Structure formats: structure tokens, C-alpha cells
């Protein structure tokens, strides 16, 4: 997230990104987006045609010019805060001394060694990323001594403590939770909120001990005071130290971060191949020609020519260097691809951020990414050297790896990009640079319903600061056409939800050849996957969260269909329970949602009750109008007349403050004692875990004054009077009056002589007063209801709800809300990190290569999952499609039943007879979406009535809607006698 | 037939120890992890040595030597 | 789709309806809605019936069904609008495994034995706690005024 | 012509609506037919919220408009 201690060091850092080829451009773009304070480019070589196939900053007009100078303008334009300055001179020891992290992208081995030695001498962090075809390496040296402030990616653990005791161990008891299992002995803990133990707050952190049955201890607390209650105990992160060898010593004995021994040996073979490529480039002065057999043979001979001493002596390789892998790497090492550049740039930029901010765990000096699966299968014909020869086109950097025919096949495709946010924008960039649809016969399509918002704009790169309010699809399409002029993008504003199926009908999905879904919700992803499965379309789905990432491809009839987590899909839109709002808020998130919905019903419903409903047709004589007026009018002040007083003061704010917590708690305790239940008399436990007490406001405390400030500002904004922020003068003005409540204790509760109001003792006088207030408000200015806007900080919504939640949680003893719960809340969500978005976009680009390649076995496709903070990356082939069978019938998750209606539409009895005769199954229930057509348990007369009727006519009669024009098929779900309770028969496609 | 001592790594950098069986199905391990963490079974899928785990298969196929690490991966919603 | 599960549950339940329920039928046009007559046993509600509407969201069972009374009822934890705060229907306690039979059993128990732990009508709960006889009389009046005749 | 009108409860019940007639006079009749309070949900086509002071021709009410309502508030 946005950490103030970490981000202070980001803006103060300066990074050198040498070799600004495609990979260096991606690293520089990611660093600029993340917001590094300075960034020095260095690449004086002239731009070639091959560089355009993977670099997005360079255009065709920027040909025959220095890459760094040309890219400087766009890199500076991406973010104004970032200062990008090109460096013209050669690398000098003083220059490397000035910097903090240097990056050598696609640089020669000699220069890599020289710069790495110079940086390691001065303690400067060094990274040497590279990509030669479909295989890319990564090196990360952070000096001899490097201390990471926080190793893990996790909020420090906080758990509510029930009871603490004194003694030699000084054991303490905490409420049951997952944190109890999470807490471990030898850790470091701190505490800030506790009732009692006054000086224990702000003390030095101390260790703990884990005992059986969730028992812990702090030490010696006998000398301390009495303990009443405890808010929470916060875990403390333990700093770690990492030592990295220099590049010159590391080349001989590489340390690869992997997940299995096979992966380690594969990475060793890739390292040997890269060393062979560097040696070949040194000996001959020229990289291997595209797919040239003689150069590949020379490279593999050099790989065998490498000494056995070049490997570690403590673990011999199980086999000699496989000639096939080295030969394939040498053949395909001509050009540089766009997906590989995106992936390696993402990883390298994340490592640079780790170096700068001292966050997470740095890479263990060597990561090798293998993506050779995208090559044509061994049965198919490999590209010939004549095909891979450059022809002056901007795609030659990719033609040198895949060939001309594959480039034409990419040009012929016609895809669909559902959702263009961050993943959508970067996948669109990958599609544009790759060449997908850049032709007359090709095309593309972008589907997006939201508008550009500044908070989300702060991280994306296709969007600019002057595009706020424009649709995302239009701007993304314009940017994609800018990156590749030949590309034709059709931006569609209509979303893709079940209510728009008539726009995206059979013809629309008959036009497309594939779908790439980058959506923010699970329900939308499930719906898009269902549509793709129904229309048998390849799907490319990606999803990130923090530094996490996941890219998957679901080709029809070869991989399992996408199945979203139904639990998360349900949790997407679910209401919170009312019991926690009513009496017992168990957690701080409960009081958070309590404050949210309480302010919502206090303000959103207030406006309609002011003018519209009261003035239109109804009066106080409705179901319960006096309660609706009581919840809003008296709490904000007695009023009852047009307020000539300034709407920005403290007289009415503290009244609502007291009524919110103190008066409510007092009323609840009046209803029943906090320790006893009146009905129970002698319950199992008298007052179990529930003891709320009235809370008194403290002017010195920041939470109370912030709550008053937010309430006053919001009231002024909604009432229409110009509200001024109190933080400069009116905060002191409310501090100026310390005791406004003593003079106005009794009269503010209800009317003038209602200490408790008993039960409906208000009478006609209070009812008539409420009616008069309603009439005054109706003729007065109508209040404008305000929605939750995170971007607009003047409304004071998030701060107000957080302050209310904190106040009520401290009132109930619940630990205060942390930033982690606010992040987990759907509202106030953070933008996705640029690095992980680039990584998932590059993986999706590789999947697109494999899909466009044509008919592929299941073993070719790969579903990827990554965690950049832990440098944990996996790429596994997906499972075979699930085969579930019932009696003789056998079906997959993709196939469907086909039954033509014929020239005369079949009757329902005819359909049932046809099903029984053909597929050998007897249907007991047959629905059309929700409407029921035939049931086995129906009465014989009802069945005899329904059977002869026409199927389409019956559907029209039940639904009441005419069949959609140009609708080829009708989908029906059916069951069978004696079937499994959870079985899922394939849908019945009935033509009409 | 003897119980195994394996640890499942959480998604927040933490770990916990579990006692499983070679003949015990992966779905049972998923149930134990869900019960300890408090998350739904379908929301997460757990992997071992870079490859995913199938629910119906038993732990014997995957070669889970004692004191092994089985990472827990969540399904990612953000776009 | 949840429609198949709802249809199967309704077909299974119609064969052996519980004693407190009767004529539980659904419209074929929209099978995600049920109409039932609730026949409690504890007084004064046992002298008549109560028509309730059970609506199943499309993502059932992962979203608990929404049960709402269609006829008025004087209960401590039932609003005049007809909503219910059954513990099983609560999000934190719901599970996909439980059927609708258990929900109906819990609803019948709740109606027979009024609950005061989570009063959706706090004033009525206070009246019941203070003077139960006045609450009893008010419940009798509400039933005789708004209730539907108890079928055979 | 025909415009797809749908409710949030799973029943569409398409009604005769035309651009020559004001949208409010048809929405009030639909609300009176359904029987649910209008303040509970706002009718909306293609994600565009509808306001008491909002010209319908500016956003271009499309034929077969994707009009559906979203439940709000808290009954209890
Ligand atoms: O990059 P991101 O995480 O912000 O992506 C969110 C984008 O998703 C669009 N969206 C969301 N849901 C849909 C559907 N069902 N169809 C089409 N687009 C969709 C939003 O526009 C948002 O920008």
C-alpha cells in the first residue's frame, strides 16, 4: 500500500537504467509509474527496426536516433513528479557513486562485469536483466551487507486481549481467533490500547512465550498497576539481513531461486546457454543469426566447450548439458518479444523498488524465466532462416523469433478485450505492440462502462490527467491506435452483464475469435466465462491483488472451464448482519459498517423526508414518521425555525456526539443491566463478553475533534451553507468552548420536560411540533444527498465513518480499526501495483501467442501464478477437463446437447420422446432458466395439458415475451430420474 | 499409515503445522487449512513444488515427504 | 443454476410437508419464489394462519433465502414490513450445506417461541419483558385484526 | 416500439413505453403496478443514474434499453 516511511525514500532515490532497449523501456516505465524521484537513462545507440517490436516509447518516426533521448520525452510525460534526465557520457565511477540502484538491461557481459564490480565496491545495488528470445535471466546484487526493514508482505498481527495477570511469567489471556495460532514464541509485540497499565503504553517492545491452550506471557507486570481491559497486542516485524556475492564470483556458482530440483537444473542449463551466447557474441562480435543452424551448432559447441570447473563442485549435474535446450535457445535468440519484456521488466522493477524502499525480500541473485513452449510443436514445422529475415517492418523483432507466417496469423485475428482498467490497458499495449489485429482483416474491441477517475488514474499509463470524466474504453482505444496506427479498435461503452445480452448477441460473438477478460469482480468473470463456454471461445483471464498475480487461459475442449469461487461471488454483494449494529458489535469491521449505514440512513434518507415525500402525498400519519424525523432533526439541533446562525459551529455537533455513544449506551443499560439478563435471571454466564460503558469526550484527543470536524463539514456541505475546514480556526473555536454541555444537559434530550419519555408519552404536542418542522423544511431549501466519493476529500466521508467506527469500537472495548480492514473494504480500494499488472499482462501475451499459434495440446498451455514480494513464480500446465458421467451418457464441462426443432416445432412430449430415444435418459424436471416446463411429479391432468403444447409457444406463454428475433438456439436445463443430487447435466440447446 | 508432519504456508508469510496421512485425500487437507485459516475452501487452492494439487487425488501421489512446505494460493479478484 | 436445486427441494418438501406448513406452492413462471401458510401452535398465533413469501436469490445457496411475511404479525423480532432476523438466515451463520427444511423448522420454532435476543422491534420487546400480559393482549388483537383464517 | 422492462425480482413484465411520452408518467404507473416504494431503488439504463432533474434525451434512451433497479436502504 501507500506507506509514508517507505515512500519518503522512494522520492529521494536516483536510478540509472542503462541499455534502453525494450526491456529497459519497460523497467523505466514501471519505475516512473511507481513514482521514483529521479531516473537517469543511458543508451546512445541509434534506434533500429528490431527495437520497435518490443518498445512502446519509440515510434517509427524516432528511427535512427539515440534510444535514451527519444524515450526521455515520453517517460517524463508519463509522470510529472518523476524527473527523467538522459545521460550522454559513458559510465564513470563517480556517476555510479552518485546513484543508488543501477540497472543494465541487455548489456554485454564485459560491461555487466565492469559495472557490477564498480557498484559492489561502493555498496551500490546492481541489477542485470536480459532477454534473448523466449528465455530471460535476472541478476540482483545488493552488496555485502543489506538489511531489509520488513521481510513479509502482511500487516502486523493485532489480537484483542481478554485478561492479563501479574506474576513472574505475567501471563495474559486473549480472545479466541486465528491470531492465536498466528502468534508464535520468540516474537516481538507492542500494545497501545489497554484499560489500565498506563505506562505500559509507549514502552519498549518485549518478547513473548507460547504456552499450551493459547497461553502467552509478557514478563514481570507485578510492579505495574491494575488492568481493567485490553484493546489489542501488535506484532513487531523482525529486521533481516541478506548478503549477496558480486557478479564476477556469482557467475561461476549461480544461486537460482526456484521451487523444485528439476527447476533448479533447468535454470542451470539456461545459465549455461546464456554464458555460451555471451561467449559467442564476444568471439565473433555478432549475435547468432535468426534460426541459423550453423550459429546454433557453434553456440552449443561453446556450451559443451565450457569447463567442468565452471559448475559447482559440491553438487554434480545429473546429466551433461542437454544439447536440445541450448540449441533451441541459440536458434530463437535473435529478436526480443513484447510479453517477455513486460514480464522481466515487471520483476526487475519490483527488485529495484525492494532495493530502494528496503521492503520485502530481495531475489537470491538469479532468476531464469523459460517460455520456450510458445514455439511451434515438434510435429509442426519450425521457422526457416529465410522467413525470419527482417523486411524493414516494425514487427521484425518478433518475426526474427516466430517467422512471417505466424505474424500474418496474428494480423488476421479478431479479439475482444472485456474491461480496460490497469490490466486492460497493459494487455491492450501488449496486443498493440505484438500486432494482434493490426490489419484490414483484423480488428479489436474494448468493453468498459466506468469513467476515468483520478485515484485509478494515478497508476495507469494509457490515461492522462486531462482525460478525467471520459469513458475508459474511448481513451484506451485512442491510446492503442496511437501505439499501433494499423490497429483498429472499436470502443464499446455498454457493459457485459446479463441485462445486456441483446446487444452482445449471437452475431457479435460469431464475429470474434477470442476473449481476454481483465475484470475487477468475480461475478463479472463468471458471467464472461459462461458466455465464452456457451460460444466456445478462447479466454484469457488475469487477476492481481497487491503484489500477487495470476494469468490463465481456458481453451475449449482442452482445459477445464473457468469456475469462480462461489463463496466470493456471493460475498461480492451481501448485506451485513443487523445484530452487531443493534447490540453487540463483535469486531471493528462491524462498527465500521454500522457507522457507514447509520450515516447513510441519517443523510441519504433525510433529504427525501425533507421535501419530496412529505410535500407530495403523505404526512406524519404514515407507518412511522416521528421516528424518521427524530433520527435526523433533533440530533442535529433543536432548530424548528430557519437557521440564521452559521452552519459551521460546535453547538449541535457535540449533541449528536453524546446521543450517538453516551446516550445510546445509557439507554441500552437502562433497557438491561450490562452484567445481567432480566429474563434469564440466572443464565449460564451473566453478561458474557459484553460490558459497554458510557464514553465521555476529550477535547485534547484527536479522534473526537476529528469526528466533530468531519460532522460539521459534512453538515455544512449537505445543508448548502459554505462550510469552512475547522482544522485552522474552528478546531480551536471548538477548543475555545470547553464546557458547552453543562448548560444544556436536560433540555436537549427531548422537548423540555421528557427526562426519559417513557413509552410514547410525547403526545400530540410533540407530534404537532414534528409536523411543523416538516412543513418548515418543505418550504425551506431542499437538502442534497451526498454519496461516498473517495476522490473528493472535501466531503469528509471516509474520515467521518472511520472516526465514528473508532469511537464506537473503543466505546465497546473493540480494538481500533486498522488500515488493513479499510483496504479489505471494497470501498477505499487501492490501485493495483504497476509491476504485478505488467507481469500478468506479459503472461497473458504469452498465452495469446500459444492460442493464435493454432491447434495445441493441453500440455502446451500454462496457467501462471506469481508473488513478487516473495519472488515466487510458477507456470504449470492446466488440468484435463473434468469428465463426469451418468449411466451410459458421458459429458464434459464444455459439450452441449443439440436437438433441432425441425420445420414444424416439436411438442414437449415429442421433445421428451426424442431425448429418451436418442440419449437414453428420462427427464423429470425441464426448466427454461427459471420457468418450469415439464415436471415428473406434476398431476397427470396437468401433464396431459402441458405435453401437446408447442415448446416455443409454451415458453412464450410462461414468460409472456416474444422470442428474440434472430435467436438461433434456446437453452434448457434438465434433470433425470435417480440422478445425483449435485450433478450438472449439459444444457439443452433447442433450435428455433 | 503413520501420520505425517507437513506445514502449509499462509498467504501472509506465516505457516502452520498439520498432521495428515498418505492415504488422506487432498480435499481433507484443504478442509483442515480452511478451518485453521478461516477462509472458504473454494476461495483458495494449495500447491506443492510449483505444481497444483488436485482434490480427488491422494497425498501419496505428490510425494509429500515429512517436513515439506505446501504453499497456499488465493484466487485473485482485483483487475 | 439455483433454480434446479430450488425445484428439487420444493418437490421433495411437498411430498412430506411439515405439520406447521400447508399448501406450499410456487408459480411456474418464476420458480424462485414460494408461497406458504404458517400454522404455529403457541397462542394466540395458533388460532389462524400467516402467509409468507420465500424468495431465493440466483446465487442460492451461497446467498441465504430472503423470508418475508406477507400478512401482518405481532412478534418481538418481526417488523411491520414483514422482515425476519432468523439466526440461520444471517450471513455469518449461513452455510451452503443446510437445506430450506431446517430454515422452515427454525422459523416455526421462532414463531412459537418469541425471541428477545435480537429484537427487530425494541419497544415491543420492552413491553413483553415488562408486562407480558399487555403484550399478549396486543398480539391477540393484531392476530384477530390482520390474520387469515386457519385452514383445515 | 418495444423496450425491455425488467424488475429486480426476476420478472421482466415488458410494458408499453415510447419516447413521445414522458418517462416519469410511465415509471409512476409501473411503480403503482408493482407495489414497492419508488425510493427503494432507482431505475437506470446502461448504468446511468436517473435524477428528478435530468433530461432523458441527453443520454439517449436506447430502444430495448437495459433498465433495471438496484435495491438499497435497510428495512430491518
Ligand atoms: O484494471 P481494473 O482492475 O480497474 O479493471 C476494472 C474494469 O472492469 C470494467 N468492468 C467491470 N466489470 C465489467 C463487465 N461485466 N463488463 C465489462 N467491463 C467491466 C470496468 O470498466 C473497470 O474499468
Can you describe what's shown?
The complex is a heterotetramer, with 1 copy of chain A (992 residues), 2 copies of chain B and 1 copy of chain C (152 residues). By secondary structure, chain A is α/β, with parallel strands linked by helices. Chain A has 35 helices and 35 strands. An 8-stranded mixed β-sheet of chain A has the order 23-22-21-24-25-26-27-28, with helices on both faces. Chain A has a 6-stranded mixed β-sheet with strand order 3-2-1-4-5-8, with helices on both faces. In chain A, helix 8 crosses helix 10, helix 13 (396-402) packs across helix 14 (404-412) and helix 15 packs parallel to helix 17 (472-483). Chain B has 1 helix and 5 strands, in the order ββαβββ. In chain B, strands 2-1-5-3-4 form a 5-stranded mixed β-sheet, with helices on one face. Chain B is globular, with a radius of gyration of 12 Å. The termini of chain B are far apart. Chain C is an alpha+beta fold and 152 residues long. In chain C, strand 1 (21-25) and strand 2 form a beta hairpin. In chain C, helix 3 (122-130) crosses helix 4. Chain C is globular and about 50 Å long. At the A-B interface, helix 6, strand 26, helix 20 and strand 28 of A face strand 4 and strand 5 of B. Bound molecules: adenosine monophosphate. Adenosine monophosphate is lined by residues 418-419, 421-424, 447-450, 472, 495-497, 518-521, 524 of chain A.
Looking at CATH, the homologous superfamily of chain C is Ubiquitin Conjugating Enzyme
What Rg of chain A do the Cα atoms give? 34 Å
Radius of gyration of chain C from the CA trace?
A: 16 Å
End-to-end C-alpha gap of chain C: 36 Å
Structural class by helix and strand composition of chain C: alpha+beta
Continuous helix count of chain A: 35
- CATH names the topology of chain C as Ubiquitin Conjugating Enzyme
Q: Categorize the overall geometry of chain A.
A: globular
Percentage of β-strand residues of chain A: 5-15%
Taken as a percent bin, the fraction of beta residues of chain C is 15-25%
From the helix content, strand content and strand pairing of chain A, which structural class follows? alpha/beta
The domain count of chain C comes to 1
Number of strands of chain A: 35
CATH structural architecture of the largest domain in chain A: Orthogonal Bundle
Shape assignment of chain C = globular
Order of helix and strand elements from N to C terminus of chain C: HEEEEHHHE
Helix content of chain A: 25-40%
- Tell me, what is the CATH class of chain C? Alpha Beta
| Biggest beta sheet summary of chain A | 8 strands, mixed
Subcellular location (chain D): Cytoplasm; Secreted
Subunit structure (chain D): Homodimer; disulfide-linked. Interacts with, and is conjugated to its targets by UBE1L (E1 enzyme) and UBE2E2 (E2 enzyme). Interacts with NEDD4. Interacts with PARP12; this interaction inhibits PINK1/Parkin-dependent mitophagy.
Protein name (chain D): Ubiquitin-like protein ISG15
Organism (chain D): Homo sapiens
Amino acid at each position: 500500500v501507500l506507506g509514508s516511511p517507505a515512500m519518503q525514500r522512494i522520492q529521494g532515490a536516483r536510478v540509472l537504467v542503462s541499455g534502453l532497449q525494450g526491456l529497459g523501456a519497460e523497467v523505466a516505465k514501471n519505475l516512473v509509474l511507481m513514482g521514483v524521484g529521479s531516473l537517469t537513462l543511458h543508451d546512445p545507440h541509434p534506434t533500429c527496426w528490431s527495437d520497435l517490436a518490443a518498445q512502446f516509447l519509440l515510434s517509427e518516426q524516432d528511427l535512427e536516433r539515440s534510444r535514451a533521448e527519444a524515450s526521455q520525452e515520453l517517460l517524463a510525460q508519463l509522470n510529472r513528479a518523476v524527473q527523467v534526465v538522459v545521460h550522454t557520457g559513458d559510465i564513470t565511477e563517480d556517476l555510479l557513486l552518485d546513484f543508488q540502484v543501477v540497472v543494465l538491461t541487455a548489456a554485454k557481459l564485459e560491461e555487466q562485469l565492469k559495472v557490477g564490480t564498480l557498484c559492489h565496491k561502493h555498496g551500490v545495488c546492481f541489477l542485470a536483466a536480459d532477454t534473448r528470445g523466449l528465455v530471460g535471466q535476472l541478476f540482483c546484487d545488493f552488496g555485502e551487507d543489506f538489511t531489509v526493514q520488513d521481510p513479509t508482505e502482511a500487516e502486523p498481527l493485532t489480537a484483542a486481549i481478554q485478561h492479563i495477570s501479574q506474576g513472574s511469567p505475567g501471563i495474559l489471556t486473549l480472545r479466541k481467533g486465528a491470531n492465536t495460532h498466528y502468534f508464535r514464541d520468540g516474537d516481538l509485540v507492542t500494545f497501545s490500547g489497554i484499560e489500565g497499565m498506563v505506562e505500559l503504553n509507549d514502552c519498549d517492545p518485549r518478547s513473548i512465550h507460547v504456552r499450551e491452550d493459547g497461553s502467552l506471557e509478557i514478563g514481570d507486570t507485578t510492579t505495574f498497576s491494575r488492568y481493567l481491559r485490553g484493546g489489542a497486542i501488535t506484532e513487531v516485524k523482525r529486521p533481516k539481513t541478506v548478503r549477496h556475492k558480486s557478479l564476477d564470483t556469482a557467475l561461476l556458482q549461480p544461486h537460482v531461486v526456484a521451487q523444485s530440483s528439476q527447476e533448479v537444473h533447468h535454470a542451470h542449463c539456461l545459465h549455461q546457454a546464456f554464458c555460451a551466447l555471451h561467449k559467442f557474441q564476444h568471439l565473433h562480435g555478432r549475435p547468432p543469426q535468426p534460426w541459423d543452424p550453423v550459429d546454433a551448432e557453434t553456440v552449443v559447441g561453446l556450451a559443451r566447450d565450457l569447463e567442468p570447473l565452471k559448475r559447482t563442485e559440491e553438487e554434480p549435474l545429473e546429466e551433461p548439458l542437454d544439447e536440445a535446450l541450448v540449441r533451441t535457445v541459440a536458434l530463437s535468440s535473435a529478436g526480443v518479444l513484447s510479453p517477455m519484456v513486460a514480464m522481466l521488466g515487471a520483476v526487475a522493477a519490483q527488485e529495484v523498488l525492494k532495493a530502494i524502499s528496503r521492503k520485502f525480500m530481495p531475489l537470491d541473485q538469479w532468476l531464469y524465466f523459460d517460455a520456450l513452449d510458445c514455439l511451434p510443436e515438434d510435429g509442426e514445422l519450425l521457422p526457416s532462416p529465410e522467413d525470419c529475415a527482417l523486411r524493414g517492418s516494425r514487427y521484425d523483432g518478433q518475426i526474427a523469433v516466430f517467422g512471417a507466417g505466424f505474424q500474418e496469423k496474428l494480423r488476421r485475428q479478431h479479439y475482444l478485450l472485456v474491461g480496460a482498467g490497469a490490466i486492460g490497458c497493459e494487455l491492450l499495449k501488449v496486443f498493440a505492440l505484438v500486432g494482434l489485429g493490426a490489419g484490414n482483416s483484423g480488428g479489436l474491441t474494448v468493453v468498459d462502462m466506468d469513467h476515468i477517475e483520478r485515484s485509478n488514474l494515478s497508476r495507469q499509463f494509457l490515461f492522462r490527467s486531462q482525460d478525467v470524466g471520459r469513458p475508459k474504453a474511448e481513451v484506451a482505444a485512442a491510446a492503442a491506435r496511437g501505439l499501433n496506427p494499423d490497429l483498429q479498435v472499436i470502443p464499446l461503452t455498454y457493459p457485459l452483464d446479463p441485462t445486456t445480452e441483446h446487444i452482445y448477441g449471437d452475431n457479435f460473438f460469431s464475429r470474434v475469435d477470442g476473449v481476454a477478460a481483465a475484470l475487477d469482480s468475480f461475478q463479472a468473470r463468471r458471467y464472461v466465462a459462461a458466455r465464452c463456454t456457451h460460444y466456445l471461445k478462447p479466454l484469457l483471464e488475469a487477476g492481481t491483488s497487491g503484489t500477487w498475480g495470476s494469468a490463465t487461459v481456458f481453451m475449449p475442449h482442452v482445459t477445464e472451464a473457468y469456475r469462480a469461487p462461489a463463496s466470493a461471488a456471493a460475498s461480492e454483494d451481501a448485506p451485513y448482519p443487523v445484530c452487531t449494529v443493534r447490540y453487540f458489535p463483535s469486531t471493528a469491521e462491524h462498527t465500521l459498517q454500522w457507522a457507514r449505514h447509520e450515516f447513510e440512513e441519517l443523510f441519504r434518507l433525510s433529504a427525501e423526508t425533507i421535501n419530496h415525500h412529505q410535500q407530495a402525498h403523505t404526512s406524519l400519519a404514515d407507518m412511522d414518521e416521528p421516528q424518521t424525523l427524530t433520527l435526523l432533526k433533533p440530533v442535529l439541533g433543536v432548530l424548528r425555525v430557519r437557521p440564521q446562525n452559521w452552519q459551521d459551529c460546535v453547538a449541535w455537533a457535540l449533541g449528536h456526539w453524546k446521543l450517538c455513544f453516551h446516550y445510546g449506551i445509557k439507554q441500552l443499560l437502562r433497557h438491561f443491566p450490562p452484567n445481567k439478563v432480566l429474563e434469564d435471571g440466572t443464565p449460564f454466564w451473566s453478561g458474557p463478553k459484553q460490558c459497554p460503558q458510557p464514553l465521555e469526550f476529550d477535547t485534547n484527543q484527536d479522534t473526537h475533534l476529528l469526528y466533530v470536524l468531519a460532522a460539521a463539514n459534512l453538515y455544512a456541505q449537505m445543508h448548502g451553507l459554505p462550510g469552512s475546514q475547522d482544522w485552522t480556526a474552528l478546531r480551536e473555536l471548538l477548543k475555545l468552548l470547553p464546557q458547552p454541555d453543562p448548560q444544556q444537559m436536560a433540555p436537549i434530550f427531548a422537548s423540555n420536560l421528557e427526562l426519559a419519555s417513557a413509552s410514547a408519552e410525547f403526545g400530540p404536542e410533540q407530534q404537532k411540533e414534528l409536523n411543523k418542522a416538516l412543513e418548515v423544511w418543505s418550504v425551506g431549501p431542499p437538502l442534497k444527498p451526498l454519496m461516498f466519493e473517495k476522490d473528493d476529500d472535501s466531503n469528509f466521508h471516509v474520515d467521518f465513518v472511520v472516526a465514528a467506527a473508532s469511537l464506537r469500537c473503543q466505546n465497546y472495548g473493540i480494538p481500533p480499526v486498522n488500515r488493513a480492514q479499510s483496504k479489505r473494504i471494497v470501498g477505499q480500494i487501492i490501485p493495483a501495483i504497476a509491476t504485478t499488472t505488467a507481469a500478468v499482462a506479459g503472461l497473458l501475451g504469452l498465452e495469446l501467442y500459444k492460442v493464435v499459434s493454432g491447434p495445441r495440446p493441453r500440455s502446451a498451455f500454462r496457467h501462471s501464478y506469481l508473488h513478487l514480494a516473495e519472488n515466487y513464480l510458477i507456470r504449470y500446465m492446466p488440468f484435463a477437463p473434468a469428465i463426469q458421467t451418468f449411466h451410459h451418457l458421458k459429458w464434459t464441462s464444455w459439450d452441449r446437447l443439440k436437438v433441432p426443432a425441425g420445420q414444424p416445432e416439436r411438442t414437449l412430449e415429442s421433445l421428451l420422446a426424442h431425448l429418451q430415444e436418442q440419449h437414453g435418459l428420462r427427464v423429470r424436471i425441464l426448466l427454461h432458466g427459471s420457468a418450469l416446463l415439464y415436471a415428473a411429479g406434476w398431476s397427470p391432468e396437468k401433464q396431459a395439458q402441458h405435453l401437446p403444447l408447442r415448446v416455443t409457444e409454451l415458453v412464450q406463454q410462461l414468460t409472456g415475451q416474444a422470442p428474440a428475433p434472430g435467436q438461433r438456439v434456446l437453452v434448457l436445463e434438465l434433470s433425470c430420474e435417480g440422478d445425483d443430487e449435485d450433478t450438472a447435466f449439459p444444457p439443452l440447446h433447442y433450435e428455433l | 499409515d503413520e501420520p505425517l508432519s507437513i506445514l502449509v504456508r499462509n498467504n501472509k508469510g506465516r505457516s502452520s503445522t498439520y498432521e495428515v496421512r498418505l492415504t488422506q485425500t487432498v480435499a481433507h487437507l484443504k478442509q483442515q487449512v480452511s478451518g485453521l485459516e478461516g477462509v472458504q475452501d473454494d476461495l483458495f487452492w494449495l500447491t506443492f513444488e510449483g505444481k497444483p494439487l488436485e482434490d480427488q487425488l491422494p497425498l501419496g501421489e505428490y510425494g509429500l515427504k515429512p517436513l515439506s512446505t505446501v504453499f497456499m494460493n488465493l484466487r485473485l479478484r482485483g483487475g | 443454476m439455483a433454480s434446479m436445486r430450488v425445484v428439487k427441494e420444493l418437490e421433495d418438501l411437498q411430498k412430506k410437508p411439515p405439520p406447521y406448513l400447508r399448501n406450499l406452492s410456487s408459480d411456474d413462471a418464476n420458480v424462485l419464489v414460494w408461497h406458504a401458510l404458517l400454522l404455529p401452535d403457541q397462542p394466540p398465533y395458533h388460532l389462524k394462519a400467516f402467509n409468507l413469501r420465500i424468495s431465493f436469490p440466483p446465487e442460492y445457496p451461497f446467498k441465504p433465502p430472503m423470508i418475508k411475511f406477507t400478512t401482518k404479525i405481532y412478534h418481538p423480532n418481526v417488523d411491520e414490513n414483514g422482515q425476519i432476523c432468523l439466526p440461520i438466515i444471517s450471513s455469518e451463520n449461513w452455510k451452503p450445506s443446510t437445506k430450506t427444511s431446517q430454515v422452515l423448522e427454525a422459523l416455526n420454532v421462532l414463531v412459537n417461541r418469541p425471541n428477545i435476543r435480537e429484537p427487530k422491534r425494541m419497544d415491543l420487546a420492552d413491553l413483553l419483558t415488562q408486562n407480558p400480559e399487555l403484550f399478549r393482549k396486543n398480539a391477540e388483537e393484531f392476530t384477530l385484526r390482520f390474520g387469515v383464517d386457519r385452514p383445515s
